[PDB]
């Protein structure tokens, strides 16, 4: 599973 | 009138340290990460890790942790890139990029980059 | 964690014809739960930042001709410039973001063939 994002707060 | 506006060219020696800033502009600062992107000739992009311009908490990788520091300032929209004991392997140009689409992390907006020469 | 090789290196094509750049990771970017490929692509003309091009493998981020084509799943994907013009002439980035660190590949350089 991908590893969470960090595009938006 | 989206862009992340960086600060000018570096030349630094061995040992020393390096501190880049980025100011944004055009978007909320506080909406979104603030990640650091190197480039050095003949070697392909590079992640650095990330700011939360909100909480002011950072993430960094493996290569990068014990090196590296970021940092941001709200008052006035301004990220900051900090890079301790630089050697050779650390010439390139860093950029500040930001990525606004969700669940991508991929970037879509750019500062427009600032060379970092280490040399003796 | 993830490495990302591109191919080839460096890549020349005449105008008006078309320009294909692979990308290949090490362990699969599609995620089988959403049935999504987690995989950008970054045009880079000279002396300025990246552009985004193309995200989850193959959509056009908004601005981007309908001449720029994404495709390929898991492991092996695929860039495409079906009619290439004069400013295409860049540096292309394939990135991943399945996993953390996030990495790139180490692009290749597209000129005119002539």
């Known amino acids: 599973s991908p590893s969470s994002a960090k595009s938006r707060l | 009138q989206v862009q992340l506006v960086q600060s000018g060219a570096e030349v630094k020696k061995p040992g020393a340290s390096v501190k880049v800033s980025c100011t944004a502009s055009?978007?909320?600062?506080?909406?979104?990460?603030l990640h650091w992107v190197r480039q050095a000739p003949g070697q392909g992009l590079e992640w650095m890790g990330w700011v939360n311009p909100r909480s002011g908490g950072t993430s960094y990788p493996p290569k990068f942790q014990g090196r590296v520091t970021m940092t941001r300032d709200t008052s006035i929209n301004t990220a900051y890139m900090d890079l301790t004991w630089l050697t050779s392997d650390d010439t390139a140009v860093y950029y500040c990029?930001?990525?606004?689409?969700?669940?991508?992390?991929?970037?879509?907006?750019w500062g427009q980059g600032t060379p970092v020469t280490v040399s003796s | 964690d993830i490495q990302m090789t591109q191919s080839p290196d460096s890549l020349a094509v005449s105008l008006g014809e078309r320009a294909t750049i692979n990308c290949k990771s090490s362990?699969?970017?599609?995620?089988?739960?959403?049935?999504?490929?987690?995989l950008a692509w970054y045009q880079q003309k000279p002396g300025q930042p990246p552009k985004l091009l193309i995200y989850w493998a193959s959509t056009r981020e908004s601005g981007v001709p309908d001449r720029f084509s994404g495709s390929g799943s898991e492991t092996d994907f695929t860039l495409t410039i079906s009619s290439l013009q004069a400013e295409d002439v860049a540096v292309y980035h394939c990135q991943q973001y399945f996993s953390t660190p996030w990495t790139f590949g180490q692009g290749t350089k597209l000129e005119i063939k002539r």
């Open positions: 990029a930001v990525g606004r689409i969700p669940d991508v992390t991929a970037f879509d907006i």
């Open positions: 055009g978007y909320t600062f506080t909406g979104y990460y």
């Open positions: 362990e699969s970017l599609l995620y089988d739960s959403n049935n999504k490929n987690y």
